[PDB]
Amino acid sequence: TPKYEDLRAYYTKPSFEFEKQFGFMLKPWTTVRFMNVIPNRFIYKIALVGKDEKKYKDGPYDNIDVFIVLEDNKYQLKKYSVGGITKTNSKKVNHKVELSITKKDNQGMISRDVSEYMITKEEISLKELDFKLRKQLIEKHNLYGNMGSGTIVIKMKNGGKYTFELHKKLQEHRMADVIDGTNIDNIEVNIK
Numbered sequence: 001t002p003k004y005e006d007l008r009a010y011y012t013k014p015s016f017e018f019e020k021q022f023g024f025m026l027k028p029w030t031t032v033r034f035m036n037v038i039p040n041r042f043i044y045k046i047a048l049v050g051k052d053e054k055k056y057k058d059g060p061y062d063n064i065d066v067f068i069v070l071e072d073n074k075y076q077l078k079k080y081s082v083g084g085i086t087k088t089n090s091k092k093v094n095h096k097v098e099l100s101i102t103k104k105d106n107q108g109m110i111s112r113d114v115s116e117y118m119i120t121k122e123e124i125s126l127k128e129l130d131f132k133l134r135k136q137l138i139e140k141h142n143l144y145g146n147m148g149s150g151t152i153v154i155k156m157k158n159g160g161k162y163t164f165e166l167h168k169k170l171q172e173h174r175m176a177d178v179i180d181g182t183n184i185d186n187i188e189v190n191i192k
């Protein structure tokens with residue numbers, strides 16, 4: 001059967017979260033543009049992919065939150081990330097959503113567990129949902145040990161849904177997509 005070393009490695013990387021930040025653009029040096037953020041002793045460069053290229057103009061953009069995962073890249077930039085830019089919270093959010101997980105092991109044995117997942121952002125990137133949920137599946141359910149396929153489905157109060165396919169990384173352009181965190185109703189996971 002197949003291994004999933006690359007996915008387990010990616011989704012166990014540390015993540016960084018920076019809130020109420022000032023995002024700024026410098027003169028473009030390549031086709032892809034990058035928002036800069038300096039929350040500490042480092043300058044982080046966030047690639048504007050998918051919807052973000054048209055979303056952000058010259059800037060600056062204050063009152064933003066960024067979800068950062070440091071990626072390997074062709075420029076050997078040490079602090080480079082993709083997507084994950086959202087509007088900062090107007091107030092505190094502690095929104096509970098049901099998380100149901102079904103897992104089928106290699107012997108065909110099925111398990112289930114239901115828990116609560118806390119949404120703490122008004123506006124949340126698919127990047128942050130995908131990354132933190134997969135890390136939790138690895139840590140609590142051994143995702144990418146024996147099994148590495150299936151889906152995470154984010155189900156919305158308005159009937160919308162967002163699907164993350166577990167057998168591959170989230171498509172880069174989708175890391176820029178953002179959704180109303182307060183409108184998430186429940187999350188269904190199926191591992192096989």
Ligand SMILES: CC(=O)N[C@@H]1[C@@H](O[C@@H]2O[C@@H](C)[C@@H](O)[C@@H](O)[C@@H]2O)[C@H](O[C@@H]2O[C@H](CO)[C@H](O)[C@H](O[C@]3(C(=O)O)C[C@H](O)[C@@H](NC(C)=O)[C@H]([C@H](O)[C@H](O)CO)O3)[C@H]2O)[C@@H](CO)O[C@@H]1O
Pocket residue numbers: 126160161162163164165171174177
């Ligand atoms: C080359 C490439 O990256 N192409 C992508 C599309 O992805 C490919 O085609 C898909 C059909 C699938 O085969 C995938 O493996 C390929 O990489 C991408 O299409 C989305 O793919 C995902 C799964 O990876 C979902 O199926 C998504 O559908 C939904 C969803 O369930 O997430 C449908 C849903 O109705 C919709 N929700 C709302 C409220 O509109 C969401 C939502 O638009 C997205 O999740 C936002 O990111 O999508 C497929 O649409 C496609 C869109 O990202 O972009 C390239 O074309």
